[PDB]
Amino acid sequence: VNSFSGYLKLTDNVYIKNADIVEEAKKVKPTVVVNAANVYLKHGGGVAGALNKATNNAMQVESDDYIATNGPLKVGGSCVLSGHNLAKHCLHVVGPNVNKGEDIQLLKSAYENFNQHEVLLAPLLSAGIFGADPIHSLRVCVDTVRTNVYLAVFDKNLYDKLVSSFLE
Ligand SMILES: Nc1nc2ccccc2c(=O)[nH]1
């Protein structure tokens, strides 16, 4: 049903909220939730671990079956799997891990996958343990994505920094 509420307009197609993406997916019933995935679709922590836990491991069993046919995803790549109870679809996107020397230029490739979907609930890609500056990730999102993206940012202090950087 895509019932987004309380998102702050950044651009005509990019919105942002200080919120837990799991709690957003339950209220909003989005067509697409984006997972910040790794190449093995092993949902061990961060957003991936939170989304998988909210599906009581249904997402991990589906992900394993995909990886059995595909082998690992490419950095910058994605797959569309079931959203289970969270969404119609989950778009698993792999952003570069700059800690492992993956090139930050691949973050544009990662966000380009969003353009296959009219409306997405998403986190910022390559943040947290993938080591990219989240404000940089937001700039790449805004420059790359032309479909309607609703960004959820968990941490209030990071959210305020993102909105300050973008609107001040
Ligand atoms: N519930 C929950 N939400 C998150 C959102 C972003 C990153 C991490 C998390 C997390 O670890 N748990």
UniProtKB/Swiss-Prot annotation:
The gene is rep. Inhibited in vitro by GRL-0617. Residues 1-168 form the Macro domain. May form homohexamers. Interacts with N protein. It comes from Severe acute respiratory syndrome coronavirus 2. It is a multi-pass membrane protein. Responsible for the cleavages located at the N-terminus of the replicase polyprotein. Participates together with nsp4 in the assembly of virally-induced cytoplasmic double-membrane vesicles necessary for viral replication. Antagonizes innate immune induction of type I interferon by blocking the phosphorylation, dimerization and subsequent nuclear translocation of host IRF3. Also prevents host NF-kappa-B signaling. In addition, PL-PRO possesses a deubiquitinating/deISGylating activity and processes both 'Lys-48'- and 'Lys-63'-linked polyubiquitin chains from cellular substrates. It is found in: Host endoplasmic reticulum membrane. This is Papain-like protease nsp3.
